[PDB]
């Protein structure tokens, strides 16, 4: 149920759920990225 | 933003919401094709509890794309901001 | 007023900001003292290569 | 139509392949087999209808926006402030109120606006621009809030400290502050947190002007970071370097907090051995802060689940007697009245003439 | 029940109508225990030492009294002022006496953290320490205002009868007990 | 930003009142600082491009 983004330039799981303004846990950074999916995607080696 | 609409008959999200995540936004690594939604945004129709109307952000293009990275950030005016990078 | 006014009650600071950013972003200026209203002063930097 | 080709569908939804439009319904997998095309605007090129409004009213509105442009906060603060102002401009009392009460009423709406965004702002910082005074503007401020009954948060302790601490000049060298006064901001703000958290649980925050607490904590934190360099300074000597004007209560808060920390100091034998006092206790707060949660629970006499009294100062002075049962009573109010008492309160004609002569 | 304590009373406020018009200048001229200023105010100020009270009498014939500890003492003092006016020569009479307010206070012998109360009773609580140290509670049953402090002392105002003060007291007892 | 701004401010160094002689408001020097960002608590931090 909780969601896990990773912070910019420190890359520690930032663990935000509420509608609070975006923020790192220790950094001053305001920028965060989503983590990759766990579903598999197949490719054609052409 | 609201999460995917699940079919009770399947316990899996409808086709147009297939790519979404629990938070209502698309998942890096996955494969988007035409007229599937990328963010499930909703706005206030009331401008007693506020009612809400659907107005998603959809992908429209010829071929499929893969999703490279998804960014979330904010201004000081409380306005959230999403950015996404698609690849072919 | 029966007592002197203070300028800090009106010494405001959004004007310079608005003018500068609008001129650079929009790309047309009106130096109405100089009487010139040129356009096409700015272009987005082409990152083709 | 609404129906499917022949039967009980009702819904209406879009479908299209190559830039057309059609109508999706559902009782079968059908578009109702009909659809319609779309006709659109564009390839050309939030009301008006703006009332004239009372001249004085718009004059006030102009003060609203000229105020919010000072702090240069994000625009929506201005617009919503205007909305609150217009809402307040709907009652006879405010309309007939003198313009000074109007000059203050613009201030309060901007204030509550910032409070909604938990945006830290203090009372005088507003009154600075408004020719106001504490009583004038505070009494009025209460009046509108009770009139409107709108929910508004309090000043949350940690919010104001960020902007207050950041205003100091201790973070760079300058001809007024050589390096021995210079300090790292991160350490100071952390230390102030570790002190203010004590202040609230030790009842010191409640019911007092909040800012003196911050000033005392910052002064002592700055000292304790280089006590050998900084023990020689003082309240004003420190503040005027930062061009800060200090609270007079800050002396009261200082005496209070040193009294607290020596009581922590005795809890540890390896602090007890030094025979600590006012002069010396300052250079060990770095030591105490590591174990403060143990110090408080070793120091308070209130060991109950819910040697030193952990109470606010208002009764740390202790009652002279612990509030025995009050003498709630009645009397006979119907007795006769002694006329002698009444005649004692009357001037004789000689005294009447004396007062007439004096007048 | 309460913790063995019922609030004390601090002040009484009452009014009475004397049934006739008065010459304020004469009364101030001849009263040892009176103060009046005709050029700014329309009523004469007087006091008595027992019950230790003050009275405010207008030229219109209405009177306001304060300083009493109980309603009987207010009524006695008002009758005393009526007698004072009578001996001054005016046809003063004691009519339509009514109590208007009284003040009560109590202490609970333990501290109270006001922040929690304002965080839980927003509809009634005011917490602006930078403006007034005490917390203001607007109670609806009875229509009473209670003033609360960190020491556990509580003050009550706005009642017409004493039962209102004690009613508000035991109404707030469970709330503060939380 | 290093020698022209100062001249242009110098050229308009003083404003004059409508009345009340010897009432005036004077600029004496002007600075331009280094880049930084607003934040929602009237507090600031430097930023990268
Ligand atoms: Zn980080
Ligand atoms: Zn059919």
XYZ file of C-alpha atoms and ligand atoms in Angstrom:
771
model
C 0.000 0.000 0.000
C 2.809 2.510 0.695
C 4.631 3.865 -2.340
C 8.413 4.003 -2.719
C 10.078 6.696 -4.802
C 13.845 7.217 -4.752
C 15.424 10.611 -4.170
C 17.625 12.521 -6.560
C 21.363 12.550 -5.852
C 21.075 10.408 -2.722
C 18.886 7.493 -3.815
C 17.345 6.554 -0.485
C 13.796 5.244 -0.520
C 11.671 8.260 0.274
C 8.412 6.623 1.328
C 5.711 9.246 0.764
C 1.987 8.506 0.899
C 0.192 11.614 2.121
C -0.409 14.806 0.143
C 2.505 16.575 1.740
C 4.802 18.811 -0.291
C 7.506 16.731 -1.925
C 10.703 16.400 0.080
C 13.607 14.099 0.799
C 14.211 12.439 4.115
C 17.548 14.214 4.660
C 18.487 16.014 1.451
C 17.196 19.377 0.423
C 16.255 17.860 -2.892
C 12.758 18.226 -4.328
C 13.093 15.779 -7.229
C 12.177 12.109 -7.155
C 11.887 9.215 -9.594
C 9.717 6.122 -9.663
C 11.127 2.652 -9.181
C 11.031 0.054 -11.944
C 8.117 -2.342 -12.294
C 8.315 -6.004 -11.276
C 6.353 -7.264 -14.282
C 8.422 -8.873 -17.030
C 8.526 -7.545 -20.599
C 9.687 -9.736 -23.504
C 11.840 -8.539 -26.392
C 12.657 -9.657 -29.910
C 16.355 -9.918 -30.553
C 16.176 -8.563 -34.085
C -5.274 11.141 -9.056
C -6.970 7.781 -8.564
C -5.778 4.258 -9.121
C -6.699 1.726 -11.762
C -10.293 0.581 -12.155
C -10.365 -3.136 -11.529
C -12.869 -5.515 -13.115
C -14.519 -7.599 -10.400
C -14.878 -10.385 -12.962
C -11.082 -10.509 -13.400
C -9.334 -8.843 -10.428
C -7.195 -7.085 -13.071
C -7.306 -3.518 -14.385
C -9.228 -2.671 -17.526
C -7.299 -2.555 -20.757
C -6.975 1.216 -20.961
C -5.618 1.281 -17.370
C -3.360 -1.742 -17.840
C -0.055 0.154 -17.569
C -0.908 2.119 -14.424
C 0.371 1.670 -10.862
C -1.387 1.780 -7.548
C -0.687 5.502 -7.251
C -2.395 6.226 -10.582
C 0.691 6.818 -12.753
C 2.611 4.770 -15.315
C 5.386 2.355 -14.371
C 8.919 2.672 -15.784
C 10.032 -0.216 -17.944
C 6.612 -0.993 -19.378
C 5.208 -0.730 -22.877
C 2.562 1.794 -23.889
C 0.566 1.794 -27.094
C -2.119 3.956 -28.586
C -4.956 5.496 -26.535
C -3.895 4.035 -23.200
C -3.829 6.498 -20.333
C -0.606 7.640 -18.666
C -1.864 9.742 -15.742
C -5.373 9.438 -14.349
C -5.866 13.105 -13.447
C -9.234 14.384 -12.180
C -10.477 17.936 -11.623
C -13.264 19.521 -9.526
C -16.558 19.912 -11.341
C -17.888 21.962 -8.421
C -15.124 24.512 -9.066
C -22.183 19.050 -0.583
C -18.894 17.192 -0.873
C -16.969 18.071 -4.056
C -17.750 15.933 -7.101
C -15.104 15.020 -9.628
C -14.937 14.431 -13.375
C -12.510 12.348 -15.409
C -9.936 14.002 -17.658
C -6.924 11.707 -18.082
C -3.611 12.232 -19.860
C -3.476 9.767 -22.754
C -0.808 8.536 -25.172
C -1.614 9.056 -28.841
C 0.849 8.007 -31.509
C 1.570 5.619 -34.324
C 3.782 2.939 -32.772
C 4.383 1.593 -29.309
C 6.754 3.217 -26.854
C 8.691 2.114 -23.813
C 8.819 4.215 -20.652
C 12.332 5.221 -19.709
C 11.999 7.328 -16.551
C 9.229 9.058 -14.612
C 9.852 12.178 -12.535
C 7.791 13.780 -9.769
C 8.567 17.188 -8.274
C 6.913 20.359 -7.037
C 6.854 24.140 -7.074
C 6.284 26.282 -3.983
C 2.767 27.160 -5.180
C 1.764 23.569 -4.198
C 1.450 22.619 -7.878
C 2.700 19.074 -8.421
C 4.548 18.287 -11.643
C 5.025 15.028 -13.544
C 7.370 14.436 -16.456
C 7.919 11.234 -18.430
C 10.408 10.093 -21.056
C 9.264 7.705 -23.780
C 11.570 5.863 -26.188
C 11.508 4.223 -29.631
C -2.130 61.545 7.357
C -1.365 63.551 10.471
C 2.072 61.865 10.516
C 4.709 61.204 7.873
C 4.311 58.177 5.617
C 6.983 55.483 5.270
C 8.079 54.365 1.806
C 8.597 50.763 2.943
C 4.798 50.521 2.917
C 5.013 50.884 -0.888
C 8.604 50.082 -1.944
C 7.549 47.101 -4.059
C 9.592 44.655 -6.033
C 7.588 42.527 -8.479
C 7.757 45.108 -11.271
C 11.405 44.653 -12.248
C 11.068 40.875 -12.136
C 7.968 40.806 -14.296
C 9.437 43.112 -16.894
C 12.738 41.306 -17.218
C 11.387 37.785 -17.450
C 8.572 38.709 -19.814
C 10.922 40.472 -22.205
C 13.387 37.600 -22.378
C 10.794 34.840 -22.652
C 8.272 36.509 -24.961
C 10.946 37.874 -27.262
C 9.553 41.309 -28.103
C 10.341 44.598 -26.377
C 8.670 48.025 -26.369
C 11.212 50.653 -25.293
C 8.550 53.322 -25.556
C 10.934 56.061 -24.409
C 13.325 55.129 -27.228
C 10.243 54.479 -29.445
C 11.089 51.043 -30.824
C 8.867 47.953 -30.737
C 11.078 45.229 -32.198
C 10.265 41.523 -32.107
C 12.202 38.342 -32.763
C 14.994 39.036 -30.293
C 15.107 35.518 -28.783
C 15.183 31.936 -30.053
C 15.118 28.561 -28.327
C 18.523 26.877 -28.481
C 18.360 24.101 -31.081
C 19.577 20.847 -29.538
C 19.498 18.752 -32.689
C 23.170 17.870 -32.372
C -30.416 5.833 -29.455
C -29.415 5.856 -25.885
C -30.787 2.420 -26.588
C -28.709 -0.034 -28.585
C -29.870 -0.760 -32.149
C -33.038 -2.231 -30.640
C -32.748 -2.649 -26.864
C -32.165 -1.314 -23.398
C -28.713 0.253 -23.473
C -28.588 3.815 -22.155
C -25.005 5.017 -21.723
C -23.009 7.214 -24.107
C -19.246 6.880 -24.668
C -16.828 7.681 -27.475
C -14.948 5.513 -29.958
C -12.992 6.247 -33.125
C -10.283 4.644 -35.253
C -8.647 7.207 -37.537
C -9.701 10.631 -36.296
C -13.455 10.343 -36.485
C -15.898 10.064 -33.593
C -18.585 7.563 -32.675
C -20.857 6.684 -29.745
C -20.034 3.728 -27.459
C -22.899 2.346 -25.384
C -23.148 -0.989 -23.608
C -25.680 -3.671 -23.457
C -23.972 -5.547 -26.279
C -20.508 -4.714 -27.541
C -22.076 -1.949 -29.580
C -21.489 1.657 -30.627
C -25.248 1.748 -31.073
C -24.051 1.314 -34.669
C -24.602 5.056 -35.153
C -21.962 7.478 -33.912
C -21.775 11.171 -34.733
C -18.959 13.362 -36.005
C -17.344 16.207 -34.016
C -17.114 19.905 -34.895
C -14.395 21.957 -33.247
C -13.004 25.433 -32.558
C -9.429 26.687 -32.894
C -6.825 27.842 -35.388
C -7.771 31.339 -34.261
C -5.871 33.905 -32.235
C -12.440 33.935 -15.864
C -15.240 36.407 -16.532
C -15.296 40.082 -17.271
C -18.530 41.537 -15.941
C -16.516 43.367 -13.292
C -18.638 45.546 -11.015
C -17.564 49.129 -10.388
C -17.450 48.429 -6.622
C -17.316 51.077 -3.894
C -14.381 53.431 -4.344
C -13.192 52.921 -0.776
C -13.674 49.171 -1.131
C -11.347 48.884 -4.118
C -8.922 51.258 -2.409
C -8.747 48.672 0.364
C -8.340 45.870 -2.160
C -5.306 47.691 -3.503
C -3.834 47.637 -0.030
C -4.443 43.883 0.011
C -2.306 43.235 -3.018
C 0.312 45.857 -2.117
C 0.733 43.978 1.146
C 1.130 40.516 -0.311
C 3.656 41.779 -2.878
C 5.989 42.753 -0.014
C 6.681 39.180 1.055
C 6.461 38.247 -2.679
C 4.729 34.987 -1.893
C 3.199 32.863 -4.660
C 0.269 34.591 -6.366
C -2.621 32.426 -5.172
C -2.029 34.011 -1.790
C -3.083 37.343 -3.283
C -6.255 36.113 -4.976
C -7.548 34.063 -2.064
C -6.730 36.957 0.240
C -8.930 39.139 -1.951
C -11.712 36.573 -1.712
C -11.562 36.547 2.078
C -11.555 40.342 2.068
C -14.691 40.516 -0.057
C -16.366 38.003 2.234
C -15.513 40.212 5.211
C -16.898 43.277 3.397
C -20.517 42.215 3.892
C -21.431 43.552 7.358
C -22.545 46.916 8.693
C -20.047 47.062 11.545
C -17.023 46.649 9.296
C -18.382 49.157 6.785
C -18.919 51.797 9.474
C -15.649 50.968 11.245
C -12.915 53.588 11.103
C -10.280 53.285 8.416
C -7.603 52.248 10.906
C -9.644 49.167 11.711
C -9.757 48.637 7.940
C -5.994 49.032 7.637
C -5.639 46.243 10.182
C -8.380 44.037 8.748
C -6.465 43.615 5.514
C -3.497 42.406 7.533
C -5.361 39.699 9.362
C -6.776 38.060 6.246
C -3.337 37.827 4.699
C -2.162 36.335 7.993
C -4.778 33.610 8.154
C -4.046 32.881 4.509
C -0.445 32.093 5.345
C -1.600 30.041 8.314
C -3.669 27.882 5.960
C -0.500 27.031 4.008
C 1.268 26.500 7.368
C 3.479 29.307 6.095
C 5.362 30.730 9.108
C 4.585 34.357 9.886
C 4.507 36.280 13.149
C 2.337 38.955 14.566
C 4.506 42.073 14.490
C 5.971 41.295 11.080
C 2.535 42.180 9.726
C 1.826 45.050 12.081
C 5.146 46.571 10.995
C 3.554 47.967 7.831
C 0.201 49.075 9.247
C 0.770 51.824 11.851
C -0.983 49.447 14.238
C -0.444 48.567 17.891
C -0.708 45.303 19.814
C -4.048 45.975 21.499
C -5.689 47.616 18.491
C -4.888 44.913 16.018
C -5.160 41.915 18.367
C -8.588 42.902 19.660
C -9.791 43.463 16.098
C -8.199 40.196 14.973
C -10.231 38.337 17.543
C -13.350 40.159 16.419
C -13.315 38.950 12.818
C -12.303 35.404 13.697
C -15.179 34.957 16.124
C -17.453 36.705 13.610
C -16.531 34.296 10.802
C -15.866 31.194 12.892
C -13.364 29.873 10.349
C -10.973 27.100 11.349
C -7.326 28.191 11.393
C -4.199 26.467 12.776
C -1.860 27.801 15.423
C 1.796 28.691 14.909
C 3.518 25.304 14.901
C 6.737 25.511 16.864
C 9.274 24.107 14.412
C 7.992 26.082 11.426
C 8.973 29.562 12.618
C 12.483 28.577 13.661
C 13.648 27.808 10.115
C 13.059 31.345 8.898
C 14.164 32.860 12.194
C 17.451 30.957 12.448
C 18.306 31.530 8.789
C 18.201 35.310 9.254
C 21.392 35.414 11.329
C 24.719 36.570 9.865
C 26.817 33.901 11.593
C 27.225 31.763 8.469
C 29.945 33.817 6.726
C 32.969 35.807 7.801
C 32.551 39.579 7.964
C 34.429 42.525 9.493
C 31.960 42.377 12.384
C 32.370 38.613 12.880
C 35.750 36.990 12.463
C 35.820 33.229 12.182
C 35.686 32.451 15.899
C 32.099 33.748 15.817
C 31.395 32.031 12.485
C 29.589 28.705 12.742
C 27.903 26.013 10.685
C 24.162 26.543 10.431
C 23.240 22.856 10.351
C 24.754 22.157 13.765
C 23.061 25.188 15.316
C 19.587 24.428 14.012
C 19.920 20.812 15.127
C 20.994 21.881 18.613
C 18.085 24.306 18.842
C 15.709 21.475 17.998
C 17.218 19.330 20.740
C 16.615 22.214 23.162
C 13.138 23.344 22.069
C 11.875 19.785 22.350
C 12.886 19.930 26.008
C 11.233 23.302 26.442
C 7.775 22.116 25.441
C 7.733 18.905 27.496
C 9.048 20.867 30.487
C 5.972 23.123 30.169
C 8.122 26.134 29.261
C 6.536 26.786 25.856
C 2.879 26.819 26.866
C 1.284 30.195 27.505
C 4.349 32.316 26.728
C 5.444 34.463 23.841
C 7.147 31.845 21.654
C 10.020 33.848 20.194
C 12.012 34.399 23.428
C 12.411 30.627 23.576
C 14.117 30.589 20.180
C 16.427 33.466 21.032
C 17.612 31.886 24.274
C 18.215 28.521 22.630
C 20.115 29.998 19.701
C 22.301 32.170 21.929
C 23.348 29.255 24.098
C 23.697 26.785 21.221
C 26.005 29.193 19.428
C 28.077 29.560 22.590
C 28.236 25.844 23.313
C 29.549 25.042 19.857
C 32.808 26.858 20.752
C 32.525 27.553 24.490
C 36.207 28.367 24.944
C 35.813 31.043 22.288
C 32.329 32.209 23.204
C 31.787 32.002 26.967
C 32.877 35.651 27.258
C 29.930 37.017 25.250
C 26.504 38.237 26.392
C 22.920 38.544 25.177
C 23.099 41.961 23.537
C 26.772 41.603 22.656
C 25.820 38.503 20.669
C 22.653 39.889 19.111
C 24.005 43.233 17.899
C 26.628 41.301 15.956
C 23.709 39.676 14.142
C 21.897 43.048 14.209
C 19.182 41.276 16.175
C 17.116 43.034 18.857
C 16.513 40.666 21.715
C 13.664 39.827 24.068
C 13.865 41.014 27.636
C 12.121 37.752 28.576
C 15.084 35.982 27.008
C 16.837 36.644 30.309
C 13.952 34.916 32.083
C 14.095 31.983 29.667
C 17.874 31.792 30.112
C 17.695 31.667 33.881
C 14.940 29.067 33.588
C 16.848 26.833 31.200
C 20.126 26.929 33.118
C 18.132 25.989 36.209
C 16.812 23.010 34.249
C 20.140 21.867 32.833
C 21.980 21.900 36.144
C 19.233 19.614 37.448
C 20.006 17.331 34.521
C 23.719 17.759 35.242
C 23.531 16.235 38.724
C 21.921 13.043 37.378
C 25.268 11.836 35.973
C 28.081 11.163 38.428
C 30.777 11.807 35.817
C 29.098 15.182 35.404
C 28.370 15.449 39.127
C 32.071 15.231 39.979
C 32.861 18.537 38.262
C 30.578 20.507 40.630
C 28.872 22.287 37.759
C 27.337 25.753 38.010
C 26.143 28.677 35.901
C 29.592 29.386 34.465
C 30.609 25.826 33.607
C 27.429 23.968 32.667
C 27.348 25.518 29.196
C 30.298 23.580 27.778
C 28.720 20.169 28.492
C 25.358 20.451 26.724
C 26.900 18.432 23.915
C 27.375 15.709 26.508
C 23.901 16.000 28.028
C 22.028 16.087 24.715
C 23.084 12.499 24.003
C 21.220 11.177 27.074
C 18.557 13.803 27.815
C 15.688 11.299 27.669
C 17.347 9.369 30.495
C 18.160 12.550 32.425
C 14.545 13.719 32.536
C 13.262 10.360 33.770
C 16.046 10.178 36.353
C 15.367 13.756 37.491
C 11.603 14.203 37.747
C 9.819 13.356 40.975
C 6.673 12.605 38.942
C 7.469 8.966 38.285
C 3.803 8.054 37.931
C 2.692 6.278 34.768
C 0.347 9.174 33.943
C 13.319 14.259 43.110
C 12.536 17.297 40.933
C 8.998 18.469 40.187
C 8.222 18.225 36.456
C 5.615 20.981 36.489
C 5.137 24.426 34.940
C 6.593 27.306 36.984
C 3.121 28.611 37.854
C 3.067 26.253 40.854
C 6.748 25.330 41.047
C 6.561 28.323 43.387
C 4.196 26.031 45.356
C 0.851 27.123 46.839
C 0.871 28.624 50.310
C -1.902 26.108 50.988
C -3.255 23.544 48.566
C -6.618 25.188 47.772
C -8.849 24.052 50.666
C -12.569 23.884 49.962
C -13.828 27.424 49.229
C -16.373 28.947 51.668
C -19.393 28.844 49.372
C -22.079 30.453 51.512
C -25.189 32.613 51.623
C -26.369 35.296 54.052
C -29.560 37.033 55.126
C -30.012 39.903 52.688
C -33.340 41.100 54.104
C -32.302 42.715 57.392
C -32.857 46.319 58.380
C -30.239 48.889 57.396
C -28.425 51.072 59.913
C -29.198 54.660 58.928
C -26.024 55.836 60.685
C -23.923 54.264 57.932
C -26.011 56.113 55.343
C -25.690 59.471 57.099
C -21.912 59.001 57.351
C -21.792 59.094 53.531
C -23.483 62.527 53.426
C -21.742 65.893 53.544
C -22.970 68.457 56.025
C -23.981 71.869 54.650
C -20.723 73.183 56.113
C -18.820 70.595 54.068
C -21.043 71.385 51.079
C -20.030 75.039 51.376
C -16.378 74.031 51.776
C -16.495 72.055 48.522
C -18.320 74.936 46.818
C -15.529 77.276 47.932
C -12.897 74.790 46.751
C -14.617 74.377 43.377
C -19.094 13.849 41.227
C -16.293 16.413 41.257
C -12.975 16.009 43.065
C -14.409 17.387 46.300
C -14.365 21.035 45.162
C -17.117 23.322 43.852
C -16.189 26.702 42.313
C -16.035 29.833 44.452
C -17.628 33.109 43.344
C -15.520 36.182 42.570
C -17.847 39.035 41.568
C -21.510 39.992 41.294
C -23.122 42.407 38.831
C -26.679 43.667 39.238
C -29.019 46.468 38.201
C -31.967 48.288 39.760
C -34.339 51.075 38.723
C -35.049 53.746 41.320
C -38.363 54.907 39.849
C -37.539 58.609 39.503
C -35.201 61.066 37.825
C -32.280 62.555 39.739
C -30.055 65.630 39.769
C -26.536 64.227 39.526
C -24.873 67.529 40.439
C -26.692 67.728 43.779
C -25.867 64.108 44.619
C -22.172 64.603 43.887
C -22.284 67.848 45.884
C -23.647 66.225 49.036
C -22.302 62.635 48.964
C -19.076 61.858 50.826
C -18.646 58.543 48.975
C -19.304 59.669 45.392
C -17.380 60.800 42.324
C -18.898 62.493 39.282
C -17.719 64.424 36.227
C -20.659 66.087 34.433
C -18.586 67.319 31.483
C -17.715 63.841 30.155
C -20.057 61.247 31.690
C -23.756 60.917 32.490
C -23.636 58.916 35.737
C -22.316 59.354 39.275
C -19.932 56.812 40.812
C -20.358 55.788 44.456
C -19.026 53.112 46.786
C -19.851 51.576 50.156
C -17.494 49.668 52.439
C -19.863 46.892 53.476
C -20.770 45.119 51.346
C -17.667 46.388 49.547
C -19.403 47.443 46.344
C -19.729 50.264 43.838
C -22.837 51.693 42.205
C -23.350 53.577 38.940
C -26.460 55.776 38.831
C -27.557 57.641 35.711
C -29.854 60.638 35.496
C -32.379 58.332 33.800
C -32.906 56.502 37.110
C -31.211 53.157 36.394
C -28.387 51.804 38.529
C -25.570 49.286 38.042
C -23.672 47.663 40.911
C -20.560 45.495 41.120
C -18.119 44.199 43.708
C -20.507 41.809 45.442
C -19.627 38.211 46.303
C -23.234 36.942 46.386
C -26.636 37.966 45.069
C -27.991 38.673 48.548
C -25.056 40.958 49.207
C -25.665 42.737 45.900
C -29.332 43.218 46.809
C -28.390 44.501 50.271
C -25.875 46.952 48.808
C -28.411 48.138 46.232
C -30.930 48.764 49.006
C -28.177 50.662 50.827
C -27.607 52.885 47.795
C -31.367 53.415 47.522
C -31.408 54.592 51.143
C -28.472 56.894 50.383
C -30.423 58.474 47.531
C -33.516 58.770 49.727
C -31.682 60.740 52.411
C -30.399 63.060 49.670
C -34.045 64.123 49.243
C -35.120 62.289 46.111
C -38.158 59.942 46.017
C -35.960 56.875 45.578
C -37.581 53.435 45.692
C -36.196 49.909 45.355
C -37.918 48.352 42.325
C -37.294 45.577 39.782
C -33.947 44.532 41.251
C -32.151 41.947 39.107
C -28.788 40.175 39.127
C -27.003 40.403 35.782
C -23.776 38.399 36.165
C -21.310 36.767 38.525
C -17.807 35.317 38.245
C -16.576 31.927 39.415
C -13.247 30.139 39.621
C -11.811 26.758 40.586
C -8.596 24.723 40.540
C -8.086 21.013 39.836
C -4.746 20.484 41.646
C -2.992 19.245 38.497
C -1.603 20.863 35.336
C -3.409 20.909 32.003
C -1.765 20.952 28.568
C -3.864 23.470 26.647
C -2.543 22.484 23.215
C -4.345 19.149 23.322
C -7.598 20.836 24.291
C -7.412 23.306 21.420
C -6.465 20.416 19.127
C -9.577 18.474 20.178
C -12.235 21.167 20.835
C -11.522 23.578 17.988
C -15.182 24.611 17.866
C -14.929 26.046 21.410
C -11.242 26.660 22.156
C -9.012 29.666 21.511
C -5.232 29.244 21.882
C -3.259 32.414 21.064
C -0.573 32.551 23.755
C 1.208 35.462 22.105
C -2.013 37.454 22.612
C -3.393 36.118 25.898
C -1.774 33.299 27.907
C -5.070 31.703 28.897
C -7.182 29.413 26.743
C -10.707 30.645 26.013
C -13.530 28.085 25.922
C -16.943 29.140 24.607
C -19.299 26.671 26.293
C -22.876 26.348 25.054
C -24.686 24.578 27.936
C -25.102 26.704 29.970
C -24.218 29.787 27.865
C -20.983 30.252 29.800
C -17.411 31.266 28.982
C -14.677 29.313 30.760
C -11.066 30.476 31.001
C -8.471 27.746 31.534
C -4.791 27.889 32.489
C -1.871 25.477 32.577
C -1.930 25.348 36.390
C -5.358 23.697 36.335
C -7.175 26.849 37.456
C -10.488 27.494 35.696
C -12.599 30.665 35.695
C -16.293 30.930 34.801
C -18.301 33.965 33.664
C -21.572 34.836 31.968
C -24.188 33.252 34.250
C -27.434 34.700 35.537
C -27.719 32.135 38.355
C -25.137 30.242 40.390
C -26.478 26.892 39.192
C -25.222 27.874 35.735
C -21.681 28.249 37.075
C -21.763 24.869 38.801
C -23.474 23.257 35.804
C -20.723 24.429 33.475
C -18.243 23.218 36.093
C -19.425 19.631 36.099
C -19.966 19.758 32.332
C -16.298 20.614 31.822
C -15.136 18.179 34.523
C -15.174 15.097 32.232
C -13.631 17.045 29.354
C -10.678 18.255 31.415
C -10.470 14.813 33.024
C -9.601 13.410 29.591
C 26.188 43.452 -14.703
C 29.471 44.730 -13.267
C 30.070 48.258 -14.557
C 26.977 49.342 -16.492
C 24.295 48.773 -13.862
C 26.222 51.055 -11.514
C 26.367 53.936 -14.003
C 22.691 53.611 -14.878
C 21.757 53.738 -11.201
C 24.140 56.667 -10.717
C 22.358 58.605 -13.460
C 19.157 58.534 -11.369
C 20.629 58.667 -7.872
C 18.002 60.865 -6.160
C 14.235 61.392 -6.231
C 12.678 64.650 -5.021
C 9.525 65.312 -2.994
C 6.444 67.317 -3.897
C 6.864 69.493 -0.780
C 8.815 69.574 2.474
C 12.247 70.839 1.377
C 15.317 68.689 2.094
C 13.068 65.597 1.877
C 14.689 63.124 -0.509
C 15.449 59.444 -1.088
C 18.889 58.397 -2.320
C 20.483 55.310 -3.801
C 24.192 55.007 -3.022
C 25.211 51.546 -4.304
C 23.617 48.446 -5.816
C 24.454 44.722 -5.849
C 23.441 41.641 -7.873
C 24.408 38.627 -5.744
C 24.490 34.980 -6.835
C 21.745 32.616 -8.018
C 19.291 31.118 -5.534
C 15.701 29.907 -5.323
C 12.605 30.926 -3.428
C 11.073 28.484 -1.018
C 7.740 28.415 0.733
C 9.135 29.575 4.119
C 10.840 32.807 2.945
C 14.053 30.752 2.982
C 16.597 30.156 0.242
C 19.114 27.716 -1.218
C 21.448 27.889 -4.230
C 20.517 25.930 -7.362
C 22.213 24.315 -10.343
C 21.338 24.990 -13.984
Zn 17.702 12.543 -0.760
Zn -29.877 -4.812 -28.942
